[PDB]
């Protein structure tokens, strides 16, 4: 799934779907 991990919400295999939640919803 895209959306990079929280700490790294700006990674290559994803976007910033975890800017304020390491386990919230997708974004």
């Amino acid at each position: 799934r895209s959306c990079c991990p929280c700490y790294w919400g700006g990674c290559p295999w994803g976007q910033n779907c975890y800017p304020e939640g390491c386990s919230g919803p997708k974004v």
Side-chain angles (χ1 to χ4, degrees):
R1 34 177 211 237
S2 199
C3 298
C4 291
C6 40
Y7 14 85
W8 191 13
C11 97
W13 70 88
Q15 318 293 105
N16 214 156
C17 268
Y18 295 74
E20 317 169 349
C22 267
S23 236
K26 165 163 264 97
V27 206

